[PDB]
Amino acid sequence: MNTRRQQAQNIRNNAAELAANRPHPQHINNKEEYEYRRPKKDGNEPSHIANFTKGLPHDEHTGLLLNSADYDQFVLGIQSGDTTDFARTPLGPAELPKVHGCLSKQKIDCDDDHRSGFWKSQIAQGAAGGDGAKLRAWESAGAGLVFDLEGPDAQAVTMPPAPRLESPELTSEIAEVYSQALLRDIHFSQLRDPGLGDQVNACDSCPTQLSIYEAIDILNTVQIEGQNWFSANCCDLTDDEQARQRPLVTRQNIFRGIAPGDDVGPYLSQFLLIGNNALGGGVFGQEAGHIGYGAIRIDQRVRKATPCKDFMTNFETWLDVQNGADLRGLETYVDADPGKCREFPAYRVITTPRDLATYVHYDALYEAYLNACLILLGMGAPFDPGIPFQKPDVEDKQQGFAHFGGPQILTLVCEAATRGLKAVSFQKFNVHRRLRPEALGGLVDRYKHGKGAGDELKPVAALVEALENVGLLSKVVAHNQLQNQNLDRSGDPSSAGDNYFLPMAFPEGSPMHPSYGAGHATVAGACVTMLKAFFDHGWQLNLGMANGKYISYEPNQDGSSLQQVLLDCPLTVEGELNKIAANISIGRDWAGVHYFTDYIESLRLGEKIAIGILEEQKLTYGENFTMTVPLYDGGSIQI
Amino acid sequence: MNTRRQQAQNIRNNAAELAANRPHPQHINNKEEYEYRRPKKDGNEPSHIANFTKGLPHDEHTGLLLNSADYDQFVLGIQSGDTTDFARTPLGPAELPKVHGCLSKQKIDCDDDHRSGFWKSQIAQGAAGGDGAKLRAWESAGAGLVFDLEGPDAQAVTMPPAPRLESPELTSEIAEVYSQALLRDIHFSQLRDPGLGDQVNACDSCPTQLSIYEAIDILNTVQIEGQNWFSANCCDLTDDEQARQRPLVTRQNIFRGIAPGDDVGPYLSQFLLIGNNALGGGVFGQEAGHIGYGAIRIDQRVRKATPCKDFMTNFETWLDVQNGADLRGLETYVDADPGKCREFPAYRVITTPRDLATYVHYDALYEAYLNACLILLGMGAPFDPGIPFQKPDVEDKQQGFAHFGGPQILTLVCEAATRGLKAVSFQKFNVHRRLRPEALGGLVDRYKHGKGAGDELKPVAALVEALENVGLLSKVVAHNQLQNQNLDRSGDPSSAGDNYFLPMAFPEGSPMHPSYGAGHATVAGACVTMLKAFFDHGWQLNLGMANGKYISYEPNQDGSSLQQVLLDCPLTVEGELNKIAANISIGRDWAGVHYFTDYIESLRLGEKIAIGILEEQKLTYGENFTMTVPLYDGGSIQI
Amino acid sequence: MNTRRQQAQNIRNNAAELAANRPHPQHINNKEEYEYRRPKKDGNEPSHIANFTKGLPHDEHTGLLLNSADYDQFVLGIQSGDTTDFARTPLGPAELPKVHGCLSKQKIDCDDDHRSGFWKSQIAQGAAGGDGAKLRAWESAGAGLVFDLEGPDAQAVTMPPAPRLESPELTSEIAEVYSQALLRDIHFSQLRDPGLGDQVNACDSCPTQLSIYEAIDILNTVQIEGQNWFSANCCDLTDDEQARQRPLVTRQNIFRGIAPGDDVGPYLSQFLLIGNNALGGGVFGQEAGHIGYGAIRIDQRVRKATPCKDFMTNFETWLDVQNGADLRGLETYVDADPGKCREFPAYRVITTPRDLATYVHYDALYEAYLNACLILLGMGAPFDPGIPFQKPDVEDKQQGFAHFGGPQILTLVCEAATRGLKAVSFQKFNVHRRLRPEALGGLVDRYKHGKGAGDELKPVAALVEALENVGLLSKVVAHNQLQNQNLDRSGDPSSAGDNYFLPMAFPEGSPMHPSYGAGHATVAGACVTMLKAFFDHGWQLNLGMANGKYISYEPNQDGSSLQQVLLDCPLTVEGELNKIAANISIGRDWAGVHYFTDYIESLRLGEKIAIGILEEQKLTYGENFTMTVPLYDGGSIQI
Amino acid sequence: MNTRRQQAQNIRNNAAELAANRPHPQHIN
Ligand SMILES: COc1cc(OC)cc(OC)c1
Ligand SMILES: COc1cc(OC)cc(OC)c1
Ligand SMILES: COc1cc(OC)cc(OC)c1
Ligand code: NA
Ligand code: NA
Ligand code: NA
């Protein structure tokens, strides 16, 4: 034998080498960054239209990137990871320099007590209680450079190159995000086959410019150079594309994930709706929506943001946000009904995607998957049989606590997320720098308003044709017109004219970090992988039965309680863990701050981080068990 | 420069060596294990009265350990960590062998469908719906042997030797636990100086055999060989004892922690009571008790266990539990009032220690400290200034997310706990093996009933004198008599006679692992250390003001809402994080499953695990900031 | 220079590092193990219907797995590799425990002199000369854990995930195995295009329920969810599936391998039929069937098992074998004709697949490929020109013996097999644990007899539909009925009713180790790879010519001698080494103990082991030659 | 425990050293 100090030190050095050995893949992007050129006096320069430029100086009249030098500075700051270099980047409204190539002069500084004059939108002008919206900087630019003690390194895993502005995939993805924005106040019961049960409409019925049927029709129709994304056969697509490609849009599979058990049952996962039976003598059931959070409860009722209210629907509102206008928590919420109990309808069940957008808006990183973990523990879910001390207490004469009990996993789901966020923070800033759906939504408007210099916005031409040829843009301008009749933005000049901008669920829209590499999806992909690995992934959730059919739950018309959907087969631990993983990830697409490619590839990335952690941790345990980890791409891996 | 693979691998090898270098202290116990001898035919053998023997064969008439060979087998199973050796240990009711030295024959096996006949208590006889209580094994016996990737190793830190049966300290600690058991249904408002505000009595007023005043009087009076624990000067005590020693029991400091800000304000920490203002346009305030859990809420209302109802109050009930009788969740809870909202009083605010016992009974490992973290985040707490990107967003041109934001800490508190549980699981099983307060409570009864062989229970004689000479036992027998009038245990023979057993808050009492090294306190000590380190520990929590005094909260008489306590100075982030750390840890002492020494030394251990993790993780970050970590023993360390 | 000790030690350390560096792939299965659930009192549990459970307690009435705890124990024994844990697994007929979760009580033990009463079948009841069949344990469970000095490690290579019960592939594979069972007594001349020569029928003509034409028709027709395996285009299939996929079943390519030269010429390889010319003055020719085994001969005549006699055709016979009933060598063989020479027809030429099943039943591991090696050496085959000292003896002034002669390869083919068997023994037990074709054959019967609990056998429903919709099952029940008229199993109750069981060529059917990872195919893939690498793979075997066409051989109607098949082009060393590799591997499919996926993926695995050995051994030789190794997937690699 | 790659590589290096250690006798004609 060795002394423990030696044994312990080796396990950490063994884990360190194991991680170093595993394939270190090469980071490849779509090359759109320096490809798309725009005119300057000496010649053509990079436009960076396809790139994330939110926070940088945006032309206050044109609406596009003011100076390319700010982007050149912005990149060199990320690549360096230097606090000095990244703070030399101009941020927010800025004036062009007199000498070409020089960095733009920042308008707002540490001597501006009042900032009202710098914003062209009313919402931003009277944001900070009359003073005017503050500037906000880029969130975790050099977090991709930060190392970790467990799991693979941030640059030891990669995501394949993103869709392009001219690609058929991208055109269908933005069309999906546009469709989701107009279906933001649809009742979740609508997003499934009607054979499952009677569907309902949201109690707060309001002006709708698009229906669920039209969205399916449009997504299957939309095509670039006579090719639709879903219709395109395997031969035409690349290896990295074939993996992502989906089938014809169905009423069941619309806006859903592509992992096992996503299509099965209602749209929304049970773990976002159901709770547990009240601790001890059950006062209420699982339909209650109160999770068994040890002794106390977790209320599953999300805050209700004012139905049918979108933001950044005109040029001024959009531009200001793209100039890092800090408009966090300026959205309005429904006041409570004094008569009703449980703060209703101020807090209600997730009825429409509007509520799912509100969920992912402020949710804690592991909250969604910790809650899912707690429901399974409270329900009494069997763990992956491979785990030791799983037999009867009398026979095995051992019980699972610290290393093979509830406590072990409760932390594992939390651990994985920070390992995950660092890994993707690299892909977002250092590698791809893909623009946010809102930014692309801007280009469509800017192009259709014939803005930009010479042939600057020529790349997006092909995209805008396809969207208008399926008559999607025709509805977006009609929707935006009604949204601009609101007193908060009616004073904004651009309200008068037509607006092709993507309606945002939040006033500030997306965060201050690039699109490709979803922060929510990487945490999801990592967290539920740990849950699936630890738990018995197959375990059919028995929520009772009614008339020889398995009971499942979804919101009711006003979100008062859950409504029964009776299925042929029951829902598994995996299926609902795979479905919640989609709900939170795709939930950002409903808000209009992510694409589909952002979800699926981040979900694959997060999984590799999670597996990597578990692989390294198996050196510690001396039992030499096995963990069956089901992958999102069919079959399962043994750990 | 190096390639990242090399850089990354070094940071993990550097962290691995750093941990190996830090002092590896020597594990020293009180030696009570093999000291206390009892008579056999050939001569004297180890009694193991001072040791944890819960689960092993206990003499069904005598009430003590049946065969020492079972303990000799039990130890060798722990020391080996072999699944085969630890499963060769006899568990539950057992028959003595015919050959002396041979292991006892187990009564209950995998052919006993019905087990009613093996239990001497009624509760256990009709436990498994008439079949009879199942056996339960020892939780994480070889978790102290399991290694880890971050933080110090399980055997790379130690806890000093526990109090002894003859020691003055132990006598005052069991007297504290006995007093807490009779004050289990006292209103928390009572546990503080009356100058702070008007105190109240619990709405469910019932038979009380001890008052708050008597408890203070008794704890200051109680003494062994003419020396009281609190009265004893520094000269008499050892270095390991001097650190633990407390002052004269005061109305303010009674049953509280000994960390900075424990004595200040009410007994119960704010983070167990208050929530946050409702997300967006606040429908309710912080007095509501709804935590800002992202978009959804966490209800601070704990399940109300039937007031003034204790368990293991007679020999039969106690013995069966000590024979690993699985009586989990057999305690009764109050049914809801149909008229009242928010499942009242089924779920209410933590009014009496009965509710704090119910909290720690089922609480998730990091729940208590995650909730505390969420309240601080929702309140808008400043982080430790040392952390980078803390300046205005315009000036610094960066924001904290993955590495120096909310997400970073949310996981850190969860990470630490599993690292902590393994470290103490060693101290519990492998090193000390100190008996649970219930086990000692048994010895007092067994001795006072003149049971045991010859001079077996002579060691506890001195203890039982001190408790009876302050007239504590005189009240315990009177309390137990009333508790044994309950129909569930009135049929049990020993109900007729006097009972000196410690009343347990749970039917199964303590878990199936030794006392010394508190599972709850090690997680607390580790978790809040991470919170204090990350957050600005000094930050005075401003919960408003009333009539020129700082507002603090505590439960009201029935637990309907929070009641205002107006303080001279306000409560800090540290003080309330140190107070909740005590509440959850000492909460087990109220249930009667832990001592004070179990809390304080585990709190010191947990802190060393937490600091150890943070020290190792600082190699990853390239910013080379500093974190100020305030210790429970006064001054702060810089990381 | 260095001293040899140093040089020699380095070559072994260099080889050791080379193996460690080569990609270590991740072991991924179909996840069917814990997916397919079945009902218990508390809820759903793993059925393990898709898993290998042969030897474990099988329900004596139901016919399925008795207790899942036995499987949970069986796995943990494999994963541990502990002699103690794997011997704690219940084996054979067993009684369910009284306590749920506890391991089943074994019926047969070391005090059962007579075991007749424990078997429900007559064959097994009077097996051990009246005493009754003995139990047999699992063959090499922890051989996948055993390391090796040359070649890659057992877990340093992997096999892709197996077909699923719901998959179109699996349905066509079991249909192929079912078809092979009814074509088990077809003359091998039938399994090729009639343009090659006049085909014949087996002299022992008997009841046939399926024809060669019907088998082709059925295999092309059979389909799940309107998709046939052979018909399915590349787009629908995965990367791991596309590699395995075959074309439309042709008379030439039916039941054949998919390596170069498999389809060319007759079904059966020459090396299973032909010998060499008698040493010195040839008394006989190569058509004789006497191999030039140095000075003595190897008779190519295989023992003739009684034509048209199958086993495990009813529930009792099947169940007993699935309960590890040791029925080895209870099959009957044809008695010799006293008049005829050369023990005829007791030993005859491999006429029908019945004989090829008998060959692979008892064959030595490398026998089939050593014999093939000896025929090539005796024929005078040129070695791979790359090998040194290959030129005329006068010019080169050297000859190949120890390092580049006949002796070198003779051992190489033998060496590779043990390296191969360990590699697959991991994939069988530790990774996949795929059920044997007989086990699946059972599920079809059990389902069609409406057995199992609730929705246990729902997964196989889809499979059984496809087989019955092509009218394959309709013939299987008719075939089984005639087989159950035999006096040995006519007394068995289930003989009266219909039987859907897969007819087994052996009484004991498959061995006691899981299906996926063929023991025969891994040895084949490894052995012939060494032969192809060493020999001149291209070398056209000249067995004379007749009427301007190249002569090839196949069995005659009674197996008296070989019959001439005249080809357009001659057969190569590679083609016949690739064809014998299939014959022995697919030979197990004819017996009904393997699928096609078991052959092809094991063939690919075995090749990687063989290449790995040769790569490591090239460090030893100082000549620095090259070896051209043709792969089964087209092109050749240089060593 | 170690990962198999490490365990496997050691067994081959251990075998290689074991052979090198065993007496290397002198070749006399
Ligand atoms: C989900 O990502 C975030 C979005 C935010 O709103 C702009 C703020 C933030 O800081 C905690 C994180
Ligand atoms: C707090 O420690 C525990 C106490 C328990 O009740 C016996 C069960 C347990 O398993 C999760 C842990
Ligand atoms: C081909 O694999 C085997 C099959 C056997 O019959 C059950 C026995 C065996 O032991 C040598 C090996
Ligand atoms: Na258990
Ligand atoms: Na900030
Ligand atoms: Na020669």
Side-chain angles (χ1 to χ4, degrees), chain B residues 392-633:
Chain B
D393 287 30
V394 32
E395 185 144 35
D396 68 358
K397 276 154 187 169
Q398 258 269 42
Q399 209 197 312
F401 185 53
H403 62 322
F404 294 121
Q408 157 93 143
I409 183 180
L410 284 182
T411 181
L412 280 198
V413 288
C414 307
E415 289 166 29
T418 274
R419 328 304 163 162
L421 275 183
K422 292 175 182 172
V424 62
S425 188
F426 180 70
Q427 294 292 299
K428 295 167 85 69
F429 279 100
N430 301 45
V431 179
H432 304 301
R433 299 187 272 277
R434 185 193 192 178
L435 82 183
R436 282 280 175 155
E438 66 192 24
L440 179 63
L443 306 196
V444 171
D445 182 288
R446 292 300 82 193
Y447 160 83
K448 205 71 203 166
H449 278 259
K451 289 299 181 186
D455 57 70
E456 170 165 13
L457 295 176
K458 178 153 197 170
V460 307
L463 177 149
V464 176
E465 300 297 340
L467 268 78
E468 196 167 15
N469 284 330
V470 298
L472 179 50
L473 295 193
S474 305
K475 326 207 202 206
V476 171
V477 300
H479 172 82
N480 283 310
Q481 183 162 32
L482 285 178
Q483 219 77 62
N484 294 322
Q485 303 208 3
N486 194 334
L487 289 175
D488 66 346
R489 77 200 70 175
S490 59
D492 296 332
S494 302
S495 295
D498 302 8
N499 295 124
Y500 291 87
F501 295 105
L502 181 60
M504 293 299 127
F506 321 129
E508 79 288 344
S510 66
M512 303 299 296
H513 45 248
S515 194
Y516 193 30
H520 279 95
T522 317
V523 172
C527 288
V528 304
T529 287
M530 292 284 209
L531 288 165
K532 288 188 302 168
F534 198 80
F535 279 107
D536 206 329
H537 55 272
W539 189 64
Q540 328 186 86
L541 303 169
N542 208 242
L543 307 170
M545 272 179 291
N547 303 325
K549 292 279 185 170
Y550 293 105
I551 295 173
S552 175
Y553 291 98
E554 71 176 9
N556 77 337
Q557 66 145 37
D558 67 333
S560 282
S561 185
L562 303 179
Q563 199 174 26
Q564 288 187 357
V565 176
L566 288 77
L567 310 181
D568 297 22
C569 288
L571 305 169
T572 62
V573 159
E574 176 178 6
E576 295 309 296
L577 280 171
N578 285 349
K579 200 153 73 195
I580 189 163
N583 291 146
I584 300 297
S585 308
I586 303 288
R588 299 292 283 181
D589 306 14
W590 285 102
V593 309
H594 275 324
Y595 308 89
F596 179 79
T597 30
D598 289 17
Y599 147 67
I600 184 59
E601 290 297 345
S602 296
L603 198 75
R604 300 222 184 91
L605 182 72
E607 149 174 302
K608 293 169 193 169
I609 305 295
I611 292 175
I613 295 163
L614 292 179
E615 280 182 10
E616 289 167 28
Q617 281 199 23
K618 204 196 162 177
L619 306 182
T620 68
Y621 317 117
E623 288 80 5
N624 290 338
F625 68 106
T626 305
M627 266 170 174
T628 31
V629 191
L631 310 181
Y632 306 121
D633 306 334

Side-chain angles (χ1 to χ4, degrees), chain C residues 136 139 328 360-361 363 508-513 520 588:
Chain C
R136 52 175 197 165
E139 293 171 34
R328 295 174 209 175
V360 303
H361 195 192
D363 69 322
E508 79 288 344
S510 66
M512 303 299 296
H513 45 248
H520 279 95
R588 299 292 283 181

Side-chain angles (χ1 to χ4, degrees), chain A residues 278 283-284 290 297 341-342, chain B residues 187 203-204 288 299-304 333-351 355 555-562:
Chain A
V283 63
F284 54 65
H290 287 109
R297 321 136 85 190
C341 301
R342 198 164 156 186
Chain B
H187 193 285
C203 64
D204 302 307
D299 196 36
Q300 285 274 38
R301 306 299 191 77
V302 72
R303 194 74 212 273
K304 177 173 180 186
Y333 293 95
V334 165
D335 272 308
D337 185 24
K340 294 268 200 162
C341 301
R342 198 164 156 186
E343 270 59 33
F344 197 89
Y347 289 99
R348 73 163 186 193
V349 179
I350 314 188
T351 316
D355 292 328
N556 77 337
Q557 66 145 37
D558 67 333
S560 282
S561 185
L562 303 179

Side-chain angles (χ1 to χ4, degrees), chain A residues 4 279 303 341 366 410, chain B residues 4 153 279 303 341 366 410:
Chain A
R4 177 147 185 98
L279 175 63
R303 194 74 212 273
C341 301
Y366 49 64
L410 284 182
Chain B
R4 177 147 185 98
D153 212 26
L279 175 63
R303 194 74 212 273
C341 301
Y366 49 64
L410 284 182

Side-chain angles (χ1 to χ4, degrees), chain C residues 231-268:
Chain C
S231 305
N233 67 330
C234 83
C235 312
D236 291 16
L237 276 46
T238 62
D239 289 323
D240 58 306
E241 282 172 34
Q242 281 179 38
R244 305 194 296 251
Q245 198 211 333
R246 307 182 275 182
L248 253 56
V249 173
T250 317
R251 193 167 178 78
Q252 192 65 32
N253 71 21
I254 194 180
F255 305 131
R256 294 214 187 181
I258 61 164
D262 271 306
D263 301 355
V264 172
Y267 185 96
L268 216 67

